[PDB]
Design an enzyme around this catalytic site. Structure first.
Site, PDB file in Angstrom:
ATOM      1  N   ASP A  33       0.855  -1.230   0.179  1.00  0.00           N
ATOM      2  CA  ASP A  33      -0.192  -0.065   0.199  1.00  0.00           C
ATOM      3  C   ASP A  33       0.994   1.261   0.069  1.00  0.00           C
ATOM      4  O   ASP A  33       1.025   1.685   0.980  1.00  0.00           O
ATOM      5  CB  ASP A  33      -0.726  -0.186   1.217  1.00  0.00           C
ATOM      6  CG  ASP A  33      -1.940   0.835   1.384  1.00  0.00           C
ATOM      7  OD1 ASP A  33      -1.883   1.894   0.579  1.00  0.00           O
ATOM      8  OD2 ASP A  33      -2.670   0.635   2.552  1.00  0.00           O
ATOM      9  N   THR A  34       1.104   1.990  -1.050  1.00  0.00           N
ATOM     10  CA  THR A  34       1.577   3.213  -1.236  1.00  0.00           C
ATOM     11  C   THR A  34       1.090   4.487  -0.622  1.00  0.00           C
ATOM     12  O   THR A  34       1.504   5.404  -0.174  1.00  0.00           O
ATOM     13  CB  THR A  34       1.891   3.677  -2.784  1.00  0.00           C
ATOM     14  OG1 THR A  34       0.577   3.721  -3.417  1.00  0.00           O
ATOM     15  CG2 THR A  34       2.807   2.693  -3.495  1.00  0.00           C
ATOM     16  N   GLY A  35      -0.301   4.333  -0.339  1.00  0.00           N
ATOM     17  CA  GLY A  35      -0.985   5.338   0.226  1.00  0.00           C
ATOM     18  C   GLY A  35      -1.078   5.414   1.859  1.00  0.00           C
ATOM     19  O   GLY A  35      -1.631   5.689   2.519  1.00  0.00           O
TER      20      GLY A  35
HETATM   21  C1  LIG Z   1      -3.191   2.573   6.897  1.00  0.00           C
HETATM   22  C2  LIG Z   1      -3.219   3.946   7.382  1.00  0.00           C
HETATM   23  C3  LIG Z   1      -1.906   4.101   8.218  1.00  0.00           C
HETATM   24  C4  LIG Z   1      -3.274   4.880   6.330  1.00  0.00           C
HETATM   25  N1  LIG Z   1      -3.296   6.361   6.618  1.00  0.00           N
HETATM   26  C5  LIG Z   1      -2.400   7.246   6.422  1.00  0.00           C
HETATM   27  O1  LIG Z   1      -1.194   6.857   5.825  1.00  0.00           O
HETATM   28  C6  LIG Z   1      -2.647   8.474   6.846  1.00  0.00           C
HETATM   29  C7  LIG Z   1      -1.895   9.588   6.535  1.00  0.00           C
HETATM   30  C8  LIG Z   1      -2.223  11.092   6.919  1.00  0.00           C
HETATM   31  C9  LIG Z   1      -3.654  11.041   7.594  1.00  0.00           C
HETATM   32  C10 LIG Z   1      -4.013  12.460   7.889  1.00  0.00           C
HETATM   33  C11 LIG Z   1      -5.088  12.705   8.690  1.00  0.00           C
HETATM   34  C12 LIG Z   1      -5.622  11.552   8.862  1.00  0.00           C
HETATM   35  C13 LIG Z   1      -5.400  10.202   8.627  1.00  0.00           C
HETATM   36  C14 LIG Z   1      -4.334   9.930   7.956  1.00  0.00           C
HETATM   37  N2  LIG Z   1      -3.714   8.792   7.622  1.00  0.00           N
HETATM   38  C15 LIG Z   1      -4.338   4.645   5.308  1.00  0.00           C
HETATM   39  O2  LIG Z   1      -5.603   4.414   5.990  1.00  0.00           O
HETATM   40  N3  LIG Z   1      -4.147   4.774   4.159  1.00  0.00           N
HETATM   41  C16 LIG Z   1      -5.334   4.546   3.179  1.00  0.00           C
HETATM   42  C17 LIG Z   1      -5.502   5.718   2.414  1.00  0.00           C
HETATM   43  C18 LIG Z   1      -5.344   7.042   3.173  1.00  0.00           C
HETATM   44  C19 LIG Z   1      -4.596   7.863   3.119  1.00  0.00           C
HETATM   45  C20 LIG Z   1      -4.638   9.256   4.019  1.00  0.00           C
HETATM   46  C21 LIG Z   1      -5.666   9.414   4.771  1.00  0.00           C
HETATM   47  C22 LIG Z   1      -6.711   8.603   4.654  1.00  0.00           C
HETATM   48  C23 LIG Z   1      -6.590   7.472   3.894  1.00  0.00           C
HETATM   49  C24 LIG Z   1      -5.042   3.208   2.555  1.00  0.00           C
HETATM   50  O3  LIG Z   1      -3.907   3.483   1.558  1.00  0.00           O
HETATM   51  C25 LIG Z   1      -6.215   2.691   1.720  1.00  0.00           C
HETATM   52  N4  LIG Z   1      -6.877   1.980   2.594  1.00  0.00           N
HETATM   53  C26 LIG Z   1      -6.396   0.661   2.816  1.00  0.00           C
HETATM   54  C27 LIG Z   1      -7.185   0.034   4.218  1.00  0.00           C
HETATM   55  C28 LIG Z   1      -8.517  -0.350   3.824  1.00  0.00           C
HETATM   56  S1  LIG Z   1      -9.686  -0.970   4.784  1.00  0.00           S
HETATM   57  C29 LIG Z   1     -11.459  -0.424   4.601  1.00  0.00           C
HETATM   58  C30 LIG Z   1     -11.975  -1.848   4.402  1.00  0.00           C
HETATM   59  C31 LIG Z   1     -13.187  -1.998   5.259  1.00  0.00           C
HETATM   60  C32 LIG Z   1     -13.739  -3.273   5.302  1.00  0.00           C
HETATM   61  C33 LIG Z   1     -13.022  -4.250   4.429  1.00  0.00           C
HETATM   62  N5  LIG Z   1     -12.079  -3.937   3.569  1.00  0.00           N
HETATM   63  C34 LIG Z   1     -11.780  -2.791   3.606  1.00  0.00           C
HETATM   64  C35 LIG Z   1      -8.953   0.889   3.173  1.00  0.00           C
HETATM   65  C36 LIG Z   1      -8.291   1.859   2.184  1.00  0.00           C
HETATM   66  C37 LIG Z   1      -9.048   3.195   2.102  1.00  0.00           C
HETATM   67  O4  LIG Z   1      -8.863   4.098   2.973  1.00  0.00           O
HETATM   68  N6  LIG Z   1      -9.804   3.011   0.929  1.00  0.00           N
HETATM   69  C38 LIG Z   1     -10.618   4.254   0.436  1.00  0.00           C
HETATM   70  C39 LIG Z   1      -9.935   5.455   0.210  1.00  0.00           C
HETATM   71  C40 LIG Z   1     -11.134   3.968  -1.060  1.00  0.00           C
HETATM   72  C41 LIG Z   1     -11.863   4.502   1.333  1.00  0.00           C
END
Ligand SMILES: CC(C)[C@H](NC(=O)c1ccc2ccccc2n1)C(=O)N[C@@H](Cc1ccccc1)[C@H](O)CN1CC[C@@H](SCc2cccnc2)C[C@H]1C(=O)NC(C)(C)C
Lengths: 99, 99
Positions: free
Chosen positions: A25-27
């Site tokens: 995951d790059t994000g």
């Molecule tokens: C794993 C965390 C450390 C990571 N967050 C961060 O790296 C991060 C960076 C800066 C921030 C600033 C403010 C608040 C939050 C912040 N979070 C993250 O959630 N990254 C997300 C993207 C992102 C970046 C920044 C902020 C918010 C979100 C990930 O790549 C993508 N992510 C991977 C985990 C899945 S779990 C969701 C799910 C539920 C049930 C079943 N299956 C899956 C969901 C999916 C996502 O967010 N996807 C979208 C964007 C489509 C909603």
């Protein structure tokens, strides 16, 4: 190795010898895994994303085998719906995003 | 282009002509942007993140210009701390994760 992104880039990683399936995951700024017990030496932290935050346990210098490499990195354990290998690990592996 | 993952892989994209900064996200199945108004032909969607679910407006066939390419893709709008381009767009752009 190259990963087209049609499907989720998911691979098998071994964390302290335990196989887990993880998302490359790059994000993600941090790496977070569920269902693994890492022991007593951690720091309570928080991690967030879309939808809010979750409590985590941060472990340092964890042994990881993935994509035929061996690295030690910081991993959090917590109630994540999917296991994530974020930038911290990707960088250590020498992975890049290209077009 | 190539992106080492030391810093977040963030670029400028124009969505229906409006500039926004977006994160190239291999871990995201969908694309979600904040603070652009894309109009009235949307359908509401509930999307799940690491901390919970959010309500979004889904728009189809949005014109996107990024990394010197032009694509039409589905985009959601909602409260996201960071604008994200997920696999739906990354795929159409022809990006890959490489090691
Ligand atoms: C794993 C965390 C450390 C990571 N967050 C961060 O790296 C991060 C960076 C800066 C921030 C600033 C403010 C608040 C939050 C912040 N979070 C993250 O959630 N990254 C997300 C993207 C992102 C970046 C920044 C902020 C918010 C979100 C990930 O790549 C993508 N992510 C991977 C985990 C899945 S779990 C969701 C799910 C539920 C049930 C079943 N299956 C899956 C969901 C999916 C996502 O967010 N996807 C979208 C964007 C489509 C909603």
């Amino acid at each position: 190795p190259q990963f087209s992104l049609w499907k989720r880039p998911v691979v098998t990683a071994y964390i302290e010898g335990q196989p887990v399936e993880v998302l490359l995951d790059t994000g993600a700024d941090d790496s977070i895994v569920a269902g693994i017990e890492l022991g007593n030496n951690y720091s309570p932290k928080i991690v967030g994303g879309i939808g809010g935050f979750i409590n985590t346990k941060e472990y340092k210098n964890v042994e990881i085998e993935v994509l035929n490499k061996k690295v030690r990195a910081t991993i959090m354990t917590g109630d994540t719906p999917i296991n994530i290998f974020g930038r911290n690990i990707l960088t250590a592996l020498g992975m890049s995003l290209n077009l």
